[PDB]
């Protein structure tokens, strides 16, 4: 264990390209294991790869690096912050995962998602598809991908960002929905649910080519004297 862990870390430390700072990585990798700390922070160390990690951690900060792939993750991890890398893939995710933030990478497919996942921020990637969404999921941010369809939403979802994708249709929104950013997509219609949302809610469907019919439909319903639906934001030209 601890004895043989340091083995692979000083191995990995030798192969470091001139730019990489595997030197300061080795320290924190060590310190993190010595005291058994729960958070490991290797962010902004120009790292191009990673060696197996300290099994005890529950938070993993490794953003703004050059990582293209990831080593299997600690099995008791709850949070990942891997934004601003070159990630093309992702390792399987621990059931214990709650936050998964891999913004600004190059991922195309995600792995199956833990049921305990609450926050998922994988914007500015290359997702062509999405895996089924976890029930306890609260926020979904997949803006700036290659999505053209999207699976059903969970009951407890409150926040949604599907901006800048090639989406043609939109599943029914749950009542829990509070913010929905659906900008710059290929929507010509809107599920009837958007109107049934809470009155404090907000929906942004700018950039979409909503059909003339859809528009007049909405114009009439939302201007009614009894409309207690959300505010909806549009654009023209």
From TrEMBL:
**PTM section of the record:** Ubiquitinated in the presence of host E1 ubiquitin-activating enzyme, E2 ubiquitin-conjugating enzyme and ubiquitin.
Q: Which residues form the signal peptide?
A: none
Q: Where in the cell is it found?
A: Host cytoplasm; Secreted
Instruction: Specify the superkingdom.
Output: Bacteria
Protein family membership:
Belongs to the LRR-containing bacterial E3 ligase family.
Report what the protein is called: RING-type E3 ubiquitin transferase
